[PDB]
């Protein structure tokens, strides 16, 4: 649930 998706094809967590 921590997912931060910053832009196309970019995931942290």
């Amino acid at each position, epitope marked *: *649930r*921590k*997912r*931060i*998706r*910053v*832009g*196309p094809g*970019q995931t*942290v967590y």
Partner: antibody
Amino acid sequence: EVQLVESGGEVKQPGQSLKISCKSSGYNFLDSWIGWVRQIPGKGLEWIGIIYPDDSDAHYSPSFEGQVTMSVDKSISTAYLQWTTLQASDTGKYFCTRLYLFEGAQSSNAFDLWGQGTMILVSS
Amino acid sequence: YLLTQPPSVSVSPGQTASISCSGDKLDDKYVSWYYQRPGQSPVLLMYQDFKRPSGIPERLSGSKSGKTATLTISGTQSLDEGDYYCQAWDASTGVSGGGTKLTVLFGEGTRLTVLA
């Protein structure tokens, strides 16, 4: 009523310590990031940082780091911002906010919830 | 990086206003926009470039092109006056390790005047 309720505005002398809070209800507190944003009267929006309530993982903006501490108390759905020593440049209205994880075949995040702000005026 | 917005835009009621938000990494970074009336808390208008969260009217639409995102308000009424902010993120790993460091960035905001 999903919402964020912050603590009262306050006047402080420089040198003093400080702790404002931000209280959560209406959704699952541990699961969404909390960010902090400052706004000097008449000025734009400035990012302070974000904190994950579940694990206290934290991200800080350079110009705030080491000057201000984010923390959360999980047992009371409450997030904190605190200054060990206050400066005049610390003046502003402080917003807490919930980063929401929107989902789809292309997920992402935006700050969809905002506390009402906490006015902090530092002055001799 | 930083987000550059026009300090102010003026529009006659019933016409269309565009608010631009340029930035060097914005061509691989989702952009969100926020409204804020003087005195009140900011409110989310748009996220992931062009998507409206529930309750925001169709007459508002976001877009992006190259290193410039845009918010567009058609049918501008007086109540639309106020400050508009774009925002995006940065994510980079530090040269010496320790995971991805996130940055939240905001444009300096655009004040919208509607000439009634």
